[PDB]
Design an enzyme around this catalytic site. Structure first.
Site, PDB file in Angstrom:
ATOM      1  N   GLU A  15       0.837  -1.191   0.000  1.00  0.00           N
ATOM      2  CA  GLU A  15       0.000   0.000   0.000  1.00  0.00           C
ATOM      3  C   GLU A  15       0.877   1.248   0.000  1.00  0.00           C
ATOM      4  O   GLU A  15       0.795   2.066  -0.913  1.00  0.00           O
ATOM      5  CB  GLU A  15      -0.944  -0.012   1.204  1.00  0.00           C
ATOM      6  CG  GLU A  15      -2.208  -0.820   0.973  1.00  0.00           C
ATOM      7  CD  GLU A  15      -3.114  -0.969   2.184  1.00  0.00           C
ATOM      8  OE1 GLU A  15      -2.718  -0.532   3.285  1.00  0.00           O
ATOM      9  OE2 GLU A  15      -4.219  -1.521   2.023  1.00  0.00           O
TER      10      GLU A  15
ATOM     11  N   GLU B 268       7.421  18.771  40.093  1.00  0.00           N
ATOM     12  CA  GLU B 268       6.534  19.448  41.029  1.00  0.00           C
ATOM     13  C   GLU B 268       6.632  20.961  40.841  1.00  0.00           C
ATOM     14  O   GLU B 268       5.633  21.613  40.544  1.00  0.00           O
ATOM     15  CB  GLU B 268       6.863  19.039  42.467  1.00  0.00           C
ATOM     16  CG  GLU B 268       6.425  17.624  42.810  1.00  0.00           C
ATOM     17  CD  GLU B 268       6.622  17.224  44.262  1.00  0.00           C
ATOM     18  OE1 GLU B 268       7.219  18.015  45.021  1.00  0.00           O
ATOM     19  OE2 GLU B 268       6.170  16.123  44.635  1.00  0.00           O
TER      20      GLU B 268
HETATM   21  N1  LIG Z   1      13.876  31.204  53.836  1.00  0.00           N
HETATM   22  C1  LIG Z   1      13.400  30.248  54.628  1.00  0.00           C
HETATM   23  N2  LIG Z   1      13.590  30.351  55.967  1.00  0.00           N
HETATM   24  C2  LIG Z   1      13.106  29.382  56.758  1.00  0.00           C
HETATM   25  N3  LIG Z   1      12.436  28.282  56.426  1.00  0.00           N
HETATM   26  C3  LIG Z   1      12.265  28.212  55.095  1.00  0.00           C
HETATM   27  C4  LIG Z   1      12.698  29.122  54.156  1.00  0.00           C
HETATM   28  N4  LIG Z   1      12.333  28.708  52.881  1.00  0.00           N
HETATM   29  C5  LIG Z   1      11.691  27.577  53.070  1.00  0.00           C
HETATM   30  N5  LIG Z   1      11.624  27.226  54.398  1.00  0.00           N
HETATM   31  C6  LIG Z   1      10.999  26.047  54.981  1.00  0.00           C
HETATM   32  O1  LIG Z   1      11.096  24.991  54.051  1.00  0.00           O
HETATM   33  C7  LIG Z   1       9.804  24.371  53.857  1.00  0.00           C
HETATM   34  C8  LIG Z   1       9.721  23.852  52.443  1.00  0.00           C
HETATM   35  O2  LIG Z   1      10.812  22.927  52.210  1.00  0.00           O
HETATM   36  P1  LIG Z   1      10.766  21.980  50.917  1.00  0.00           P
HETATM   37  O3  LIG Z   1      12.143  21.490  50.615  1.00  0.00           O
HETATM   38  O4  LIG Z   1      10.001  22.660  49.831  1.00  0.00           O
HETATM   39  O5  LIG Z   1       9.907  20.742  51.468  1.00  0.00           O
HETATM   40  P2  LIG Z   1       9.101  19.594  50.698  1.00  0.00           P
HETATM   41  O6  LIG Z   1       8.709  18.592  51.747  1.00  0.00           O
HETATM   42  O7  LIG Z   1      10.022  19.154  49.594  1.00  0.00           O
HETATM   43  N6  LIG Z   1       7.817  20.423  50.122  1.00  0.00           N
HETATM   44  P3  LIG Z   1       6.707  19.902  49.045  1.00  0.00           P
HETATM   45  O8  LIG Z   1       7.379  19.618  47.726  1.00  0.00           O
HETATM   46  O9  LIG Z   1       5.666  20.969  48.849  1.00  0.00           O
HETATM   47  O10 LIG Z   1       6.045  18.640  49.527  1.00  0.00           O
HETATM   48  C9  LIG Z   1       8.789  25.454  54.238  1.00  0.00           C
HETATM   49  O11 LIG Z   1       7.595  24.873  54.751  1.00  0.00           O
HETATM   50  C10 LIG Z   1       9.524  26.258  55.317  1.00  0.00           C
HETATM   51  O12 LIG Z   1       9.256  25.799  56.623  1.00  0.00           O
HETATM   52 MG   LIG Z   2       9.461  19.428  47.487  1.00  0.00          MG
END
Ligand SMILES: Nc1ncnc2c1ncn2[C@@H]1O[C@H](COP(=O)(O)OP(=O)(O)NP(=O)(O)O)[C@@H](O)[C@H]1O
Ligand SMILES: [Mg+2]
Ligand SMILES: Nc1ncnc2c1ncn2[C@@H]1O[C@H](COP(=O)(O)OP(=O)(O)NP(=O)(O)O)[C@@H](O)[C@H]1O
Ligand SMILES: Nc1ncnc2c1ncn2[C@@H]1O[C@H](COP(=O)(O)OP(=O)(O)NP(=O)(O)O)[C@@H](O)[C@H]1O
Ligand SMILES: Nc1ncnc2c1ncn2[C@@H]1O[C@H](COP(=O)(O)OP(=O)(O)NP(=O)(O)O)[C@@H](O)[C@H]1O
Ligand SMILES: Nc1ncnc2c1ncn2[C@@H]1O[C@H](COP(=O)(O)OP(=O)(O)NP(=O)(O)O)[C@@H](O)[C@H]1O
Ligand SMILES: [Mg+2]
Ligand SMILES: [Mg+2]
Ligand SMILES: [Mg+2]
Ligand SMILES: [Mg+2]
Ligand SMILES: [Mg+2]
Lengths: 476, 469, 475
Positions: free
Chosen positions: B60, B289
């Site tokens: 074909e 994510e």
């Molecule tokens: N500048 C900052 N100062 C203090 N704590 C911080 C700051 N930035 C982020 N955090 C903390 O870090 C947390 C997020 O960390 P992360 O590594 O994103 O966690 P995860 O468990 O991977 N999050 P997710 O992907 O949403 O399930 C926040 O809830 C804060 O408590």
């Molecule tokens: Mg995370």
């Protein structure tokens, strides 16, 4: 003057057929493409010649005799020899690459007489009907062929074709009822994995084992595993073997029984592989052979992680007291796994065995098929007088709750429960002989520590409550 | 029964060497499965690798269409056609056709042949009996000549009959099934070898992908548990954690960081890749994510600059939604990008994201795939998993992914004095002593500061502890 | 190498990785009411209006007048295009009165051929090829191949409409068209529960790449509009915005981020809609436009409940800084809902947005479908740099006994966790900034009281354990 049977020589078929195939009668062996119809039909003839000195004829309606011979060379069957010794005759009824079955019946009878054949195989009868253009006198012609062969007085195997695995038994939906005996080969696609099964549906005038039984096509032909037939009949002794961990042997009341199935259940990192590693060391130290069946870690990883615990497996390998058999659980099906085990065992002839782990082999596979594996492995070891240590990773990380398969728990003689315990903001670990069957076992839930030396089983958490939870409470 | 190497990536492993020589192999499937690709790829490799001329019988699709379509794979078939290595027999509107093939075989001294599609040649009236007799001829004649054939057939159903007339399978010596299964709203390509008369083969379906290099099969079964293992350590970026891991992570290890949302898995990922680029190690982040922009910002708030790392040419942030493609594709993306960049460390944030809208057995095949590929290529893998329960901390990656990992870092929340504190714990560490403590840790502008454990508390794992006495 | 032609249909060029192969015929099959005739008219219409590419549409049933009439709904003056000679509809409908007769398509081939040259048509459409055989007998494979080849020689990109009986069954009627066609597209109108879902799949593009699987689309006044999630970049900034509550801003390290997705989760009546109301009140207080997408309460109730919290939505609706779009979730599908949202955002051009609630839109839908909705809405908001406050009601009454059962946690950047707490035989409330990506947040389960003024966040429950359970214990 009941229906007597003739041995097939196929490992397990004679067990599930309560003797073999009815003598002087034809058996329909139906199945889809790749089920092992031709292998079964050939193996029936091959074993006839080699074992029982019964010549056989093979009627081929498509596959060339030369092709049939080359395909059997994998199994180690020199069909050229059997042909050159007039023990096997392959009647070529294949069309030239360039109406009612009656002439062929004459040709078969002539051959049967010429080669004094007691067994015949016809493969496949569905072909001639299609190859020509019958599809109308299938019942009439199949009845003729069956009847004429009954007159000759030859045990026949007739290969049929299917399209659906759990659908009609044959193509024209008529071949089953004419035939005296019906066997169904299946290759069921479960998930993304195939499973070979055999069923004897019908044996008029005799008894047989009902239901599907798993089988495998190896380099030794079809090997059925009569899971149901394998009877509860062992030896059982009070002779003991050591674990490699002395305090555990005291906890087991002298050590594991030689005729025993040992299970180590616990969360990830609890230290099951160490217990396994020490159990194989003990064998090799006591001048015993053992095999490790790994399904989680590679040799290199096992060797490294062991040398950290202070166990030289290479020295045991070099000594010829250890054989590590590493394989992914999805490297094959549970049916083939059990065969690879049984085969490797027969070669090395081990005293102890260890599968690490069972939970890995239960990935994806049904709880039913896994039960069949466990029972198959359990039963083989107890029958072959091999001590067996098995591992199982519990999904629940904290303490202990239950077992995934209730089959495992009741099929094991000794159960070692490893768990985690939270003590003062630290992840402690605890060991417990939950079950021993036939001995005193320490009823204590003792702390243990993993070191470079190995496991150091300490004392029980006597001043704590709710230790099974994994988060206890100190009680003053 | 000897076999011919097809050159198809993974097929020669599943088929335990390749396709039987001199015999014909039926390759059935629905539209868009990849039958014409397989058949073209079979011939192509024949000539470019094994110096075996091939003849392609078309019924074909026009010869020039075949060449036009093949160009996508980077196959200059016209060059081969000019050089008299490839002949495309145009049977587009059996003894006659066979006679023509035989001529072409000898005219070009061909050792391989591809016939596509056979179902079309019977698309007149030929029914069941006619097809069985006719296919038998083709297969038989081709066997006489002495040529290894690939024969294409059509299906109307993915888990139904192998062919159309329910006849082509039983005639052919070898049967290969190509499927494209719509699982929900995503298609998954799979190869199965049903039958290889006279020899052994890997049973069951195995996933494949049609790439710019053609059919690429990744057998999970043929993947052997034969990777290496060293005692060479690599740092997490957090020195207290390295001390908790008894020196650090292993270079030959799969790391898992499990915990609730916001516990700080991505921070541990950030510091992991920071250490890599600090030691001039190439690394990739496969993010499923967040986006590169938000990752860069949130990292800068942690005192981590991915932009400089990327500029140096040591960090590669590959962002994609899990729903953009299937897991089979995702894996091919991971494998491909790794082969180009040649990274020493890798990161997947998260595995729990890729599990969304997929079977446990498929996600298992995925994890088992990436894990193994990383271990075989000596690439350290930091994987992340988000638990659905944000304090219960009942299980970890509840899908038997723990037995595959070598290290487990458990992050959890702890309710202390009406405040939501965090905790870190090296749950497992194969081949090393690890600190058994459930240490408190605090995230700052500087990053993770792992403090001491909760000695004066109980039921810490519950997420709602009790002060003792 | 196979080049592609931009169809102009929204999304198709993304899933087709360029468009439809040029000089090749594409099969577009589907059941009745799938949008096969729309797609084909849209293919031709866009061709002319965008790329000055004339088209010819072959009909074997419906009259040109009707095709022109039906197209009017999309705002396509096809008669204009017909008059200018830009479009031609070859009527090959059966003669009202006549008789029947092997079947050959040689006649139509030359009629189509003639018009093709006459009108210099780059694009062609056949609809429906099944009918031409469904009027006599089925030659289908041969006759299909004839048309594809003849049109290939002419070098016109063709769309061949075909009809199916079942949604997840044979790709076409006779089980042939698929194999003979180079390109295959399957339109589907799947009935799940009692609601229909439109999906596009490209099954095959010979010699080219494409996105595999089903993708959702809707037929509107614009025509077919496909929404590939895989096609989707979202930028990020450290610019803070206020929640309307000053204490929560402090707890969120100086307010929410402008480039963020806020989620408020809790049991019924924990006070998510109050925070939503305050969030929007701030935007309007800072002369910024906002839209509230409500799926639980009416405009009247929202206003009443807002005024009881001391928030006048009417003034901001009147000042042109607030739009309240109320609608039940079951009024449409999520595929449609999303297009309503995107469209309403395009008009008002807001700085903040709100969905009250996501938990309501999940009612009676596939978990996969609701995911695709959240990935879409959250993506578009982050794309256009719009701050998004989303609401979720947990089915568990007391405390945060379990988390959000929808796998949204990973998308949302800020998670506010409202819960109940039994204190001294009385139901108290609590607020906690559970997560805040890119900022310090107060890690405290602070008491909070609702009043006529609105939310009053207070001190933590330091002298209590097992707060998250909802049934604490005094230390
Ligand atoms: N500048 C900052 N100062 C203090 N704590 C911080 C700051 N930035 C982020 N955090 C903390 O870090 C947390 C997020 O960390 P992360 O590594 O994103 O966690 P995860 O468990 O991977 N999050 P997710 O992907 O949403 O399930 C926040 O809830 C804060 O408590
Ligand atoms: Mg995370
Ligand atoms: N040495 C071997 N080791 C393992 N498996 C083998 C070996 N030889 C053959 N097989 C298997 O057995 C199959 C052949 O079985 P066979 O009896 O020819 O099937 P069949 O049911 O007769 N086929 P068909 O004629 O199409 O209906 C091969 O495709 C392999 O899967
Ligand atoms: N050299 C070592 N020194 C101290 N402890 C060690 C050492 N090696 C391993 N461990 C401990 O033992 C654990 C691994 O023991 P192992 O026998 O592999 O357990 P398992 O239950 O078989 N693991 P898994 O297969 O992943 O479920 C580590 O997590 C450590 O806690
Ligand atoms: N360069 C490429 N890269 C990736 N995928 C490709 C490429 N070329 C083709 N494909 C894929 O392969 C499909 C075509 O494979 P092909 O082997 O031609 O199909 P087929 O199954 O033979 N079709 P049919 O003859 O109608 O039954 C396309 O629809 C794509 O999904
Ligand atoms: N004038 C008021 N004074 C005090 N409390 C009030 C007043 N008006 C409302 N409330 C409280 O606010 C609660 C409702 O807050 P709302 O923001 O609607 O919560 P929600 O979590 O969105 N509810 P729902 O949509 O049903 O899940 C009521 O149950 C009251 O406890
Ligand atoms: Mg056979
Ligand atoms: Mg282990
Ligand atoms: Mg093709
Ligand atoms: Mg129409
Ligand atoms: Mg509300």
């Amino acid at each position: 003057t009941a229906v007597q049977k003739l041995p097939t020589g196929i490992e397990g078929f004679d067990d599930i057929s309560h003797g073999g195939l009815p003598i002087g009668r034809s058996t329909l062996v139906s199945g889809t493409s790749g089920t092992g119809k031709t292998v079964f039909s050939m193996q029936f003839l091959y074993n006839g010649i080699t074992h029982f000195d019964e010549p056989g004829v093979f009627v081929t309606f498509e596959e060339s005799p030369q092709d049939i011979i080359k395909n059997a060379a994998s199994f180690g069957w020199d069909l050229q020899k059997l042909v050159d010794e007039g023990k096997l005759f392959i009647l070529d009824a294949s069309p030239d690459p360039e109406f009612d079955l009656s002439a062929l019946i004459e040709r078969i009878n002539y051959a049967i007489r010429k080669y004094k054949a007691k067994r015949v195989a016809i493969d496949s009868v569905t072909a001639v009907f299609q190859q020509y253009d019958a599809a109308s006198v299938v019942r009439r012609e199949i009845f003729r062929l069956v009847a004429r062969l009954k007159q000759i007085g030859v045990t026949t195997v007739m290969t049929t074709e299917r399209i659906e695995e759990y659908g009609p038994i044959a193509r024209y939906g008529v071949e089953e009822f004419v035939s005296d005996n019906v066997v169904i080969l299946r290759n069921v696609l479960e998930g993304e994995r195939r499973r070979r099964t055999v069923e004897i549906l019908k044996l008029r005038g005799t008894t047989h084992m009902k239901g599907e039984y798993p089988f495998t096509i190896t380099n030794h032909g079809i090997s059925i595993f009569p899971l149901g037939a394998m009877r509860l009949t062992q030896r059982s002794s009070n002779v003991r073997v050591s674990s490699g961990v002395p305090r555990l042997d005291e906890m087991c009341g002298g050590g594991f029984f030689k005729d025993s199935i040992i299970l180590a259940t616990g969360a990830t990192g609890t230290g099951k592989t160490l217990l396994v590693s020490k159990f194989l060391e003990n064998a090799c130290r006591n001048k015993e052979r053992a095999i490790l069946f790994a399904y989680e870690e590679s040799r290199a990883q096992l060797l490294r992680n062991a040398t950290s615990w202070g166990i030289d497996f290479e020295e045991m390998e070099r000594d010829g007291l250890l054989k590590i058999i590493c394989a992914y659980p999805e490297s094959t099906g549970l049916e083939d796994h059990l065969q690879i085990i049984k085969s490797e065992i027969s070669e090395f002839k081990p005293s102890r065995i260890a599968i690490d782990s069972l939970s890995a082999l239960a990935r994806g596979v049904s709880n039913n098929a896994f039960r069949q594996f466990v029972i198959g492995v359990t039963g083989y070891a107890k029958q072959e007088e091999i001590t067996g240590f098995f591992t199982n990773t519990s999904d629940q990380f904290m303490g202990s709750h239950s077992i995934t398969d209730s089959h495992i728990s009741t099929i094991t003689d000794t159960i070692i429960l490893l768990q985690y315990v939270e003590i003062r903001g630290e992840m402690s670990r605890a060991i417990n002989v939950f079950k021993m069957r036939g001995s005193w076992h320490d009823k204590g839930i003792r702390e243990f520590v993993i070191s470079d030396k190995g496991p150091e089983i300490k004392d029980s958490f006597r001043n704590f409550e709710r230790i099974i939870s994994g988060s206890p409470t100190r009680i003053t």
